[PDB]
Amino acid sequence: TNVFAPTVGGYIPDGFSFNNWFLLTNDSTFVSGRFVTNQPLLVNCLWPVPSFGVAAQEFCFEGAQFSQCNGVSLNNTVDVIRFNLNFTADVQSGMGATVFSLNTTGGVILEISCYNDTVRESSFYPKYCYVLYNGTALKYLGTLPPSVKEIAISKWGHFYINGYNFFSTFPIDCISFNLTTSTSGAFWTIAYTSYTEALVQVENTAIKKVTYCNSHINNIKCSQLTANLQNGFYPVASSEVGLVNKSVVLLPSFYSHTSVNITIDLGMKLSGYGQPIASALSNITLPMQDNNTDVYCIRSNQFSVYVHSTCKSSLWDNVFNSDCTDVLHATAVIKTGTCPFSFDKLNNYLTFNKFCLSLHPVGANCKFDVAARTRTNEQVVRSLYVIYEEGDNIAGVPSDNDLSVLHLDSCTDYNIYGKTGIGIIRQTNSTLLSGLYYTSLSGDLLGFKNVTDGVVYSVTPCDVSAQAAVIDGTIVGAMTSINSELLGLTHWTTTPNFYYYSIYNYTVDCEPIITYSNIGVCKNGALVFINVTHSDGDVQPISTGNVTIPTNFTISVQVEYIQVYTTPVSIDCSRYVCNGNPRCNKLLTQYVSACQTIEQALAMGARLENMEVDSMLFVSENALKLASVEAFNSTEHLDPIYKEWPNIGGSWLGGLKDILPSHNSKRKYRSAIEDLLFDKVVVDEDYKRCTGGYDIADLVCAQYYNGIMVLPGVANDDKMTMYTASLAGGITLGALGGGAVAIPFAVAVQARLNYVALQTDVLNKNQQILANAFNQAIGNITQAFGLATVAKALAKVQDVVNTQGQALSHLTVQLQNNFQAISSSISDIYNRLDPPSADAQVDRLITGRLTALNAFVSQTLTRQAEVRASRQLAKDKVNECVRSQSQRFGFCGNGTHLFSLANAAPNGMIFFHTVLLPTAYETVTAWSGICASDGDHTFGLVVKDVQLTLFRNLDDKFYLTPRTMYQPRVATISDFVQIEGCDVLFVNATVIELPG
């Protein structure tokens, strides 16, 4: 619907559609994106007009007089009046041809009248629209287009049709209209609106969402350019400072004040077109000094400046003898001109060692601009030259009177010894024996000394930076350095490093939502301490005394993301620097070396990474035949000796169905997790569409037009996906040289378990527990992808994508830099200047764009080196965790590695490492050796394999077990090494009770 009811404060409800609402612009229209803009979206009153109804009113902008307002009506001034209706040819006006009657400043009446026949200029009477002044056609606007949907009129005279400013009249005081329509559906609206700052989302030049920056959380939303804030910490300001006192501190001096009055007599005439023209014969009179009225120097310690204006009229003969009428009335003003200070700011405690005003240009450092301001324009007529010397002997004061006023222990605007700012000034006990004032490394005043008693005062900012904690789109806490309320929070607590304000009731056992270091913030706003992770400990290679061996194992799955490749870009240096202009190319022929260097660097980087990636990826046909969910769910490829197993997947299939590729995928060889990661984190690489011209070009086509070519990357993603699929399918490949003979996944898992530790319980095996744990872990991971490791992986991929996008965005936006030239467009420069003058302008653009390209190349090379190191790490991970079991401790995740699977991810891959997690320990009495006695011959026996622990069972029989898993086995004589001596920690035994 087109009718909405304004909320408190005059804000459009979030449920609106903005069917007849546009963004007002003086230039080009944004097609899509989010923008923080100052737009007339504060709806004071919304007048709904029904079908066949009549809306007739005369509105003055300084007069919020309103007729009907569905909703509350504000009492502020109205800036823009908007008509949101289909302004077709079936809209009738009660004033005849006139649709709008404008009363401008000075009583001038202007009309916007549409006729069915063309009206000649300065004469009186498809629809042709005109601006009429006194019944004569003053300006031709054009025929009414068939698609007008909104007309916005501003109090300053600007007209916006469908969002674009097509004409501006004089500032308007009052607007009379009388309209009626019948084809405007059910209701059409007239909105009185005021400007406000808001974040607007636009899609296809149409408003979709308007977020007003009216609250603290909305301020954060506008600062982040998004209406959905992720949980985290955001920098904010503690408070806002306004309406503070003023403090002035100056060195002691005599008090003598001089008033300098400048008299300006302006001469005005009426031109042939009725515009008031200010005469250059206007006179300036300075105070008399040394028989002269043309030069005046300040000779006291303090001074003030004032201007007095008189007006006279002429009749094109430069004889001023009349009084200026309403049209010819003007007021004399003084503008900055080329001076480093303004005339109106001289009475603002500015200090000089010498200040003289003159009417002659010689010896002058700068000049002011004397101008006459009329009701419509402002014209410069004279020049007032200034000769000044920097110092502190002479000060300009607001008025004649001690100038030293100091406000303490409160926010104030200070001017101390020439340094100005906003801050709080306090008295300190410190004794600094040198200097008058002190500044920081950034040049900000930190303290100053009173020259009467030597007391040192310190200066601090009134407002400081704070950190706001946002969880679920609301502010729950704030870390700040000042013990004052902020962001609507009242309760607070003290921390050794800061103050923490919160919604929590402070005069806590909760799960923190957002954490950094040892600090955590929960959902209810409470502050919690984050301690270091605790673990049971590492198993030690001890074989003496009571030792513990892990026994009961479950499965843990850990997710890791590693980047493998970048998104390579080719740049045409000539097209980037010169937008196809032949003259710019001729100029760039002298810089051709720089373009050659840039192109060579980019091409060599791309070639090296392609060579690196090419040697890493490979597939196997037989492995790819088994790499699918359908293959793992059937027994077609199983060796006939596995007739008991229903299929390849078995009990593990419930977890393998989310990792293996399936036919229910957008692309080939794609799995569920891969689709989730490529859709929840991330377009078209066809270039033939850019040159078609069938629609407005998108961002990629525009970048191509700028000479920026993103090289193909879909092929690399397909190669990575097939590589990971082949790696997954090779686990179950029974033999290599023949057909696709497959083994059950359970058999491969058993082989991996035997590699970890020799399994000695052939009959009583429980792989169902491990399979169920794996299935539940994979299910949780899949749910999380659509678990800190999953969060870290997601953050890493998101960061990679964002950095890749921003790198090209910055380079593209660097093309709108003028680089101290009249324009950033080469065609514009060559269409306005002669070639000798235009070449100098084009040279600056050339140098700036070459510098930007060099910066982009350097950043790209650094990124490429980092990704090369990351690719080396990923290759090591694939070789030592997926294609084999590594003997390196802790390399394939935290725990005892069993096997790893891999999937393709944006610009890289993700690994699922499966580890054994112990849940119990067995305690055994371990011995370092056996001291065997056979009468007079006593000899020692040590375990040959240093990784085995020797212990004794209840029946006094020696057993050996590995320390990774508790898999006891009977010791034999071949497991021992005979040595001469014995250790004190050995277990005594006889020849009869020896193993084997």
Ligand X SMILES: *[C@@H]1O[C@H](CO)[C@@H](O[C@@H]2O[C@H](CO)[C@@H](O)[C@H](O)[C@H]2NC(C)=O)[C@H](O)[C@H]1NC(C)=O
Ligand Y SMILES: *[C@@H]1O[C@H](CO)[C@@H](O[C@@H]2O[C@H](CO)[C@@H](O[C@@H]3O[C@H](CO)[C@@H](O)[C@H](O)[C@@H]3O)[C@H](O)[C@H]2NC(C)=O)[C@H](O)[C@H]1NC(C)=O
Ligand Z SMILES: CCCCCC/C=C\CCCCCCCC(=O)O
Ligand U SMILES: *[C@@H]1O[C@H](CO)[C@@H](O[C@@H]2O[C@H](CO)[C@@H](O[C@@H]3O[C@H](CO[C@H]4O[C@H](CO)[C@@H](O)[C@H](O)[C@@H]4O)[C@@H](O)[C@H](O[C@H]4O[C@H](CO)[C@@H](O)[C@H](O)[C@@H]4O)[C@@H]3O)[C@H](O)[C@H]2NC(C)=O)[C@H](O)[C@H]1NC(C)=O
Ligand V SMILES: *[C@@H]1O[C@H](CO)[C@@H](O)[C@H](O)[C@H]1NC(C)=O
Ligand W SMILES: *[C@@H]1O[C@H](CO)[C@@H](O[C@@H]2O[C@H](CO)[C@@H](O[C@@H]3O[C@H](CO)[C@@H](O)[C@H](O[C@H]4O[C@H](CO)[C@@H](O)[C@H](O)[C@@H]4O)[C@@H]3O)[C@H](O)[C@H]2NC(C)=O)[C@H](O)[C@H]1NC(C)=O
- The H-or-E segment that residue 192 falls in is strand 187-203
Residues followed by a break in the chain (C to N exceeding 2.5 Å) are 125, 401, 507, 682, 786
How many Cα atoms within 13 Å fall on the side-chain side of residue 878?
26
Closest CA to 476 of 452, 506, 498, 496: 506
Tell which positions 291-350 bind ligand V, by CB under 6 A.
306
- Name the segment binding ligand V (CB under 6 A); options: 98-106, 243-251, 353-361, 515-523: 243-251
Which of ligand Z, ligand X, ligand U, none is residue 793 near (CB under 5 to 8 Å by kind)?
Answer: none
Out of ligand V, ligand X, ligand Y, none, what residue 261 binds, judged by CB under 5 to 8 A for its kind, is ligand V
Contact between residue 892 and residue 886 where contact means Cβ atoms under 8 Å apart: yes
Q: Applying CB under 8 A, which part among 261-269, 298-306, 429-437, 666-674 lies near a second copy? A: 429-437
Residue 531 touches which of ligand V, ligand Z, a second copy, none (CB < 5 to 8 A by kind)? none
Nearer to ligand Y by Cβ, of 418 and 779: the residue is: 779
205 contributes a contact to a second copy by CB under 8 A? yes
Candidates 234-242, 433-441, 729-737, 779-787 — which segment interacts with ligand Y by CB under 6 A?
Answer: 779-787
**Contact characters 530-569, ligand Z, x per CB under 6 A:** ----------------------------------------
How many residues line the site for ligand X (CB under 6 A)?
Answer: 45
Distance CA 950, CA 941 (A): 11
Residue 170 is a binding residue for ligand W (CB under 6 A): no
Question: Could you tell me the smallest distance in angstroms from the CB atom of residue 779 to ligand U?
Answer: 20
Does residue 665 interact with ligand Y by CB under 6 A? no
Q: Residue 112 carries which DSSP code? A: E
Under DSSP, is residue 894 helix (H, G, I), strand (E, B) or coil? Answer: coil
Q: Does 414 bind a second copy (CB under 8 A)?
A: no
- Least Å from the CB of residue 22 to a second copy: 5
Strands 172-181, 98-104: pairing is antiparallel
Assigned token pair, 468: 């706001």
Tell me the pairing of strands 569-571 and 708-710.
antiparallel
The answer to whether 172 and 152 are in contact (CB under 8 A) is no
At 50, is the secondary structure helix, strand, or coil? strand
Residues 874-933 that bind ligand Z (CB under 6 A): none
155 binds, among ligand V, ligand X, ligand Z, none (CB under 5 to 8 A by kind): none
Question: CB 774: neighbour CB atoms within 10 A?
Answer: 24
- Using rule CB under 8 A, residue 504 touches a second copy: no
Q: Which residue type sits at 363? A: G
Minimum distance, C-beta of residue 214 to ligand Z, in the bound complex (Å): 23
In whole angstroms, the minimum distance from the beta carbon of 463 to a second copy comes to: 24
691 binds ligand V (CB under 6 A): no
Q: Can you tell me which of 2, 4, 12, 24 binds ligand W, judged by CB under 6 A?
A: 24
Within 13 Å and on the Cβ side, how many CA atoms surround 853? 29
In the chain, helix, strand, coil percent, each to 5? 20, 35, 45
Binding piece for a second copy, criterion CB under 8 A, among 71-79, 205-213, 621-629, 888-896 = 205-213
Near ligand V in 457-516, by CB under 6 A = 505, 507
What H or E segment, with its residue span, contains residue 493?
strand 491-494
768 contributes a contact to ligand Y by CB under 6 A: no
Q: Which helix (H) or strand (E) holds 58?
A: strand 54-60
Select the span of 218-226, 323-331, 525-533, 568-576 touching a second copy (CB under 8 A).
Answer: 218-226
Residues 598-637, interacting with ligand Y (CB under 6 A): 619, 621, 624-625
Answer for which of 134, 691, 894, 947 binds ligand V (CB under 6 A) is 134
Q: Are 587 and 688 in contact (CB under 8 A)?
A: no
Is there binding between residue 714 and a second copy (CB under 8 A)? no
Q: Which two tokens stand for residue 306?
A: 């004032």
- Provide the pairing of β-strand 930-933 with 553-563: unpaired
Choosing from 65, 168, 245, 348, the residue that interacts with ligand V (CB under 6 A) is 245
Kind of pairing, strands 172-181 and 91-93?
Answer: antiparallel
The partner residues of 90 in beta bridges, in order of sequence, read none
393 is a contact residue toward a second copy (CB under 8 A): no
Our finding on whether 53 is near a second copy (CB under 8 A) is no
C-beta of 757: minimal distance to ligand U in Å? 16
Shortest Cβ 449–a second copy spacing (Å): 9
Residue 917 interacts with, from ligand Y, ligand Z, ligand U, none (CB under 5-8 Å by kind):
ligand U
Using the rule CB under 8 A, is 201 a contact of a second copy? Answer: yes
Which residues, in sequence order, are CB contacts of 866 under 8 Å at separation 6+? none
Residues that bind ligand U (CB under 6 A): 533-536, 894-895, 917-918
Q: Does 208 bind a second copy (CB under 8 A)?
A: yes
For residue 385, which of 331, 338, 349 has the smallest C-alpha distance?
A: 338
Task: Identify which of residues 105 and 766 has a Cβ nearer to ligand Y in the complex.
Answer: 766
CB atoms within 10 A of CB 761: 10
For residue 48, list its beta bridge partners. Answer: 189
Nearest to 144 by CA among 83, 206, 90, 188: 90
Footprint of ligand W on 70-109 (CB under 6 A)? 77, 79
Is residue 700 left, alpha or beta, with left meaning phi > 0 and alpha meaning psi from -120 to 50? alpha
Alpha carbon 583 to chain centroid distance? Answer: 38
Which position among 5, 225, 319, 451 is part of the footprint of ligand Z (CB under 6 A)?
451
β 378-396/302-313 pair status: parallel
Which residue(s) pair with 168 in the sheet?
A: 158
Site for ligand V contains 116 (CB under 6 A): yes
- The answer to whether 259 contacts ligand V (rule: CB under 6 A) is yes
From the list ligand U, ligand X, ligand W, none, partner contacted by residue 79 (C-beta under 5 to 8 A by kind): ligand W
Closest to ligand V by CB, 484 vs 872, is 484
CB of 781 to a second copy, least distance (A): 54
Q: Cα 433 to chain center, whole Å?
A: 48
Sign of torsion, CA 18 19 20 24? positive
Q: Which does 516 bind (CB under 5 to 8 A by kind): a second copy, ligand Z, ligand X, none?
A: ligand Z
Examine residue 261 and tell whether it contacts ligand V (CB under 6 A). Answer: yes
10 Å Cβ neighbour count for 374?
21
Distance CA 500, CA 492 (A): 5
Beta bridge partners of 142: 129
Neighbouring residues of 385: CB distance < 8 A, sequence distance ≥ 6:
357, 358, 359, 360, 361, 364, 366, 367, 368
Q: Does 79 participate in binding ligand X (rule CB under 6 A)?
A: no
* Contact call for residue 236 and a second copy (CB under 8 A): no
* Number of neighbouring beta carbons within 10 Å of residue 924: 21
With binding defined as CB under 6 A, does residue 779 bind ligand Y? yes
All residues at 6 or more sequence positions from 298 whose CB lies less than 8 Å from its CB, including other chains: 258, 260, 352, 354, 355, 356, 394
42 binds ligand W (CB under 6 A): no
878 DSSP assignment: I
Q: Which parts of this chain interact with ligand V (CB under 6 A)?
A: 116-117, 134-135, 243-245, 259, 261, 306, 410, 505, 507
Q: Which parts of this chain interact with ligand X (CB under 6 A)?
A: 2, 19-20, 56, 84-86, 94, 103, 107, 173-174, 178, 180, 184-185, 188, 249, 265, 267, 281-283, 312, 319-320, 404, 406, 450, 452-453, 545-546, 551-552, 629, 633, 653, 657, 920, 922-923, 925, 987-988
Q: Which parts of this chain interact with ligand Z (CB under 6 A)?
A: 232-233, 433, 449, 451, 454, 466-467, 479-481, 498, 514, 516, 519
Q: Which parts of this chain interact with a second copy (CB under 8 A)?
A: 9, 11-12, 14, 16, 18, 21-23, 25, 28-37, 39, 41, 198-210, 212-214, 222, 225-226, 432-439
Q: Which parts of this chain interact with ligand Y (CB under 6 A)?
A: 619, 621, 624-625, 776, 779-780, 783
